[PDB]
Nucleic acid binder design. Structure first.
Ligand SMILES: [Mg+2]
Ligand SMILES: [Mg+2]
Ligand SMILES: [Mg+2]
Ligand SMILES: [Mg+2]
Ligand SMILES: [Mg+2]
Ligand SMILES: [Mg+2]
Ligand SMILES: [Mg+2]
Lengths: 45, 103, 70, 199, 10, 92, 138, 142, 69, 61
RNA sequence: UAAUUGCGAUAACGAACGAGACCUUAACCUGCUAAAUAGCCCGUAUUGCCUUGGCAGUACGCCGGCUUCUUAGAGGGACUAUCGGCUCAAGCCGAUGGAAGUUUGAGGCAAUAACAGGUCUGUGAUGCCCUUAGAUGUUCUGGGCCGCACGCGCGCUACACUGACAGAGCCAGCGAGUACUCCCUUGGCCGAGAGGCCCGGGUAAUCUUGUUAAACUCUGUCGUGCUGGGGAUAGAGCAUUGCAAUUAUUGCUCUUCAACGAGGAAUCCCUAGUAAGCGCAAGUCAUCAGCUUGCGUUGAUUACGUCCCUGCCCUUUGUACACACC
């Protein structure tokens, strides 16, 4: 249970973590960006 | 069927999606003969951060200021608890929704 | 107050393409331009209409070198 | 009821400053009018005008506030118009008692007489001065006259038992005539004399 | 007292 | 995607100029109005230099440089050192 | 029904909202009377819109004003700006304009600022207002 | 006609109510007078002898104008700048005990009462009647 | 430089025969020509105001000025 | 000294090394036929009036 | 013309960057869309004054009405719309509606080719060399980076009456706040002061917060004396923070009461809400701002020019210079 103001940085770092990991892992497989959609009790990538 | 005076809160970084979200929600709700309250205009939340642009400290001293804007756009309704489940469907990416029964 | 080529090309082509249906009044030129043009900015819309209505002032009183409306 | 009993005496008559009238203006000379503005009376000098946008906007402006602005200088006295307006009004009250004439009646003659008519200009001569002794425009004449009176009052009252309330007052009456014992005249005669020599 | 170097002439 | 394709062309033995030129040609058939690749580092010498390849239109000034322009940069490791690459593409 | 008009006045950061209701000639400012709410020497800067016009023209007008934000002189400039618009709106809306036109022309010839505001604000910069830091040897 | 608190100047009124409270002359004093600093930012005690009475009366004036107020609010209302030496000045609050007890004693005089439902102290029915009576005593005194 | 804080008959006699001819009387005037202290001068203003010989023109907490009647 | 009053009729550019001096065409406002050339230090408008102690001296250009 | 911005003449024609165009923001919209974490009016209940209908007030309504203030979206108008005095044209100045037309004001981004400019001490970005178990890796104890005959820079309080001291009067904005451990903090009590104890509100237009700040205003004391201006230096006592306070971290009480009378040769910044005066918010932070980045209160003298010094741009011209007048 955290405020929205602090939440909006946590999800931004979460998106950054996904991007940086994909650069370090899937560079050979033609990586070009990602997008994350958040839903209750389940998330999609 | 007991009315619970629902209220739903919204938050997002971009602004255009939320306006059409409320635009479609108000029409999706008026046609079912539900007493609807207007889309009040919550203040925008501006946030600022100052840091040095240069990474080493050499040369002249100059700063840059990043900033960020937030909108809230609260809306409320008077309806039972089960009806709002099918009224809050078909939401797109980015916009997060939080539900409060306010019983 | 000096206008670049982007307004100039559009002003000559609109003026020579559509001369008679439009007149010296600026108010008319403002609402006429967007149906017969695709412009992405309101201020540029004002820029073109503003100069074109000044040009028709000189068209009404004699000819200008380089313009041959129909 | 809604107005004070003091101002009710003057409200019936034509609008003017409460203590003193703006009628019976001097007839002494010419070439200084059109740059001193008295056609529109003002109750208190304080006003947030728009006179600092163009060149000659200050030509059509009440004189009293200009004196108040020039009265406050030297770092410490920045932004205190509440203090300045009371001091200037008290100075006009003090000068009113030594002479039955209007305080603006004395003040106008004070400004019109302490303005230099010639000045020395700086023309380069590779280490020497080709001072051509040019004349002074009326607007610069009144602009510098105000400065001389204000700096004279500040210098005289500096480190003295007297206070600026009557320290400012005494120059106006002193300068009303050719007393020659004031600071403004001290600068004025030296400037014409050096222009006379350097003609 | 006396400086040399740089651009000086006559 | 072209940035890694250039990465692949540079990891195996191949001329830098030919690999970059191949990138420049590979851009044009897709329908891009212009493209530009910058390569910097030691061009077979002790002193370092840089090269530029450019085609089509170009923008530098306005804020459209943040969205109308897609840019990328990567680091590549060689037997003796490091070479830097920067690629910009404008899409209509 | 009841005769009333609403006006508002602004300054740099001083907002003065006013309510003009048909009354009997009563003037009160911020709760306080007109004798009190001002600095002592600037209390004069409150009476000019009344004295230049005449007390006889305030027969059946009541004004209540709330002002906040800014500074003392901003507040007094807000109230002096609000009074002119309140009186001209009440006369324009509810009575013949024979009064209104002479009130407006005479008042604006005495002072133009009664009907228009003066726009002045500050500009941010990265060294202070307009001056930079001291330089070593130019 | 009828007059109220708003109809009188605050500065001359407070002197009049201090003179009126002289005639009753009954407000307890715990001996703190002539020894307290009245504020950290301050440096000299007030010269006038009935500074405790003008201050207690002034506290009742501001509580008359506010709906709920506490010791913290009166603590910072009467604060001012302090000369810290070679450092630039700041804003610090006055002493707490003097302002707390000067209005704690004001309860038993039947001027203002507690507001425990939400906090602070508010003005009482018969308490306002004293300042109202003195309003007419001063208004037509002119 | 130093003035006198007390007023004796030698200074009292000048007042009641000279104050009828001054146009203005101020603290500066008394410290200037009477060679008296400023506090004593302010007292000289207040004791003499109530005897009914001088009238108030303007009053203030920092400086006060008096003239003839 | 018989100080005389003169009025300016036209300004002709700004001369001097630093623009302090100004060149104007003046009119004697007592004999409307006569007109000479002088130098002025401050800003000048048309129909402005200046006070001149001596007129015989004339300026360059 | 602010501009390689244009009008035009033309062995040149057509094009690509930069400027502009562009984006955010301050302005303004008595319309449309709406609003109890935003307000106003309306109706009541209802305290005191004066009865008076009245006045200063307080509470209630949750579909009583409104949105005028307030907010936030969509589109409006700003384009000089119109007009005057110049010119064929490019272009410049002023007035009326309008807050504006100086490009409305201020910003963000901002060309080719470059510097042996700075950074290996930001990076699990990096070549080569070196030490790699008597370690240059890591870690624990203590000290140091602050040590002082002296020259230099960026700043703060001052050299007083245009002042100091004592009571009273009383006006802002941008922002920040609760963990797997207490973060901004109301109210009550104790306490000279710094502080201590006890309920309670706020994951926040709801509570802190109306941040009722400073400056400033009124009424008094002091009276030109380096004095009640100025507070360096030091003694004694009382507290909070942290594992730990000595070379005291800081705060509070009493006392000690230096130099400093507008500062030499030299030298920096600046064109209207601007300079200066004064405070507030955030950062680094358990505590400490004389620092920086922003925010607000009050708000000025003189000019609307020129290339003289110190520099910049275009053309003609001279050269024994090309590491380029060092
Ligand atoms: Mg461009
Ligand atoms: Mg700044
Ligand atoms: Mg460049
Ligand atoms: Mg090591
Ligand atoms: Mg001493
Ligand atoms: Mg801090
Ligand atoms: Mg030769």
């Amino acid at each position: 249970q955290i405020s929205k103001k602090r939440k909006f940085v946590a999800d931004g770092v979460f998106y950054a973590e996904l991007n940086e990991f994909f650069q370090r892992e899937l560079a050979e497989e033609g990586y070009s960006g990602v997008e994350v959609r958040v839903t209750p009790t389940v998330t999609d990538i | 069927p007991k009315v619970h005076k629902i209220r739903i809160t919204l938050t997002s970084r971009k602004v255009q999606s939320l306006e059409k979200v409320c635009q479609e929600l108000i029409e999706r709700a008026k046609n079912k003969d539900l007493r609807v309250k207007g889309p009040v205009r919550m203040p925008t939340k501006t946030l600022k951060i100052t840091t040095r642009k240069t990474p080493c400290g050499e040369g002249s001293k100059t700063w840059d200021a990043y900033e960020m804007r937030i909108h809230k756009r609260l809306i409320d309704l008077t309806a039972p608890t089960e009806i709002v489940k099918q009224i809050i469907i078909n939401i797109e990416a980015g916009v997060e929704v939080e539900v409060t029964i306010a019983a | 107050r000096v206008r670049t080529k982007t307004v100039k090309k559009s002003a000559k082509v609109i003026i020579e393409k559509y001369y008679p249906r439009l007149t010296l009044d600026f108010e008319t030129n403002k609402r006429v331009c967007d149906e017969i043009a695709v412009i992405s900015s309101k201020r540029l819309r004002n820029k073109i209409a503003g100069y074109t209505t000044h040009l028709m002032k000189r068209i009404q009183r004699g000819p200008v070198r380089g313009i041959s409306f129909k | 009821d809604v107005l004070p009993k003091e101002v009710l005496a003057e409200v019936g008559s034509v609008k003017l400053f409460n203590r003193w009238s703006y009628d019976d203006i001097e007839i002494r000379d010419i070439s200084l009018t059109d740059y001193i503005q008295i056609r529109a009376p003002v109750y208190i000098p304080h006003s947030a005008g728009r006179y600092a946008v163009k060149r000659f906007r200050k030509a059509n402006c009440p004189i009293i506030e200009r004196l108040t602005n020039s009265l406050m200088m030297h770092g410490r006295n920045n932004g205190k118009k509440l203090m300045a307006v009371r001091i200037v009004a008290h100075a006009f009250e003090i000068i009113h008692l030594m002479t039955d004439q209007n305080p603006i009646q004395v003040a106008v003659d004070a400004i019109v007489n302490c303005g230099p008519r010639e000045d020395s200009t700086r023309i380069g001569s590779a280490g020497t001065v080709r001072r051509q002794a040019v004349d002074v425009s009326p607007l610069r004449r009144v602009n510098q006259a105000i400065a001389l009176l204000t700096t004279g009052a500040r210098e005289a009252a500096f480190r003295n038992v007297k206070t600026i309330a009557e320290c400012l007052a005494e120059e106006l009456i002193n300068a009303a005539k050719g007393s020659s014992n004031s600071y403004a005249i001290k600068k004025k005669d030296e400037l014409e004399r050096v222009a006379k020599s350097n003609r | 007292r006396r400086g040399g170097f740089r651009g000086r002439g006559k | 995607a072209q940035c890694e394709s250039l990465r692949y062309k540079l990891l195996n033995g191949l001329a830098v100029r030919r690999a970059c030129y191949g990138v420049l040609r590979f851009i044009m058939e897709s329908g891009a109005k212009g493209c530009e690749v910058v390569v910097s580092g030691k061009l077979r010498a002790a002193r370092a230099k840089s090269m530029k390849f450019t085609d089509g239109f170009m923008i530098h000034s306005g804020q459209p440089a943040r969205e109308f322009i897609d840019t990328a940069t990567r680091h590549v490791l060689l037997r003796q050192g490091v070479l830097g690459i920067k690629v910009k593409i404008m899409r209509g | 029904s009841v005769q009333a008009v609403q006006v508002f006045g602004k300054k740099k950061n001083a907002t003065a909202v006013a309510r003009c209701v048909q009354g009997k000639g009563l003037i009160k400012v911020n709760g306080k009377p007109l004798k009190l709410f001002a600095p002592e020497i600037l209390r004069a800067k409150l009476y000019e819109p009344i004295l230049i016009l005449g007390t006889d023209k305030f027969a059946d007008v009541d004004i209540r004003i709330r002002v906040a934000g800014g500074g003392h002189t901003s507040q007094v400039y807000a109230v002096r700006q609000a009074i002119a618009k309140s009186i001209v709106a009440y006369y324009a809306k509810y009575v013949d304009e024979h009064s209104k036109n002479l009130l407006k022309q005479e008042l604006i010839q005495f002072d133009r600022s009664l009907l228009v505001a003066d726009p002045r604000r500050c500009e941010p910069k990265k060294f202070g207002g307009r001056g930079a830091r001291a330089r070593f040897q130019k | 006609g009828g007059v109220t608190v708003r109809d009188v100047d605050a500065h001359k009124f407070v002197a009049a109510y201090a003179a009126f409270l002289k005639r009753q002359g009954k407000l307890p004093v715990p001996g703190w007078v002539d020894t307290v600093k009245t504020g950290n930012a301050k440096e000299l005690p007030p010269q006038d002898i009935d500074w405790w009475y003008i201050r207690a009366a002034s506290v009742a004036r501001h509580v008359y104008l506010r709906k709920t107020v506490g010791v913290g609010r009166l603590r910072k209302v009467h604060g001012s700048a302090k000369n810290r030496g070679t450092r630039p000045s700041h804003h610090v609050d006055a002493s707490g005990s003097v302002d707390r007890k000067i209005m704690q004693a004001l309860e038993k005089i039947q001027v203002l009462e507690k507001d425990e439902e939400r906090g602070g102290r508010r003005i009482t029915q018969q308490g306002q009647r004293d300042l109202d009576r003195i309003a007419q005593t001063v208004a037509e005194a002119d | 430089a130093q003035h006198s804080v007390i007023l004796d008959k030698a200074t009292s006699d000048k007042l009641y025969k000279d104050v009828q001819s001054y146009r203005l009387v101020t603290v500066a005037t008394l410290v200037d020509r009477l060679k008296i202290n400023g506090a004593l001068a302010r007292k000289c203003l207040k004791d003499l105001e109530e005897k009914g010989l001088i009238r108030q023109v303007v009053g203030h907490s920092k400086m006060k000025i008096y003239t003839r009647a | 000294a018989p100080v005389k009053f003169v009025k300016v009729t036209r300004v002709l550019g700004r001369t001097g090394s630093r623009g302090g001096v100004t060149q104007v065409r003046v009119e004697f406002m007592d004999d409307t036929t006569r007109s000479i050339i002088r130098n002025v230090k401050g800003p000048v408008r048309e129909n402005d009036i200046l006070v001149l102690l001596e007129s015989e001296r004339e300026a360059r250009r």
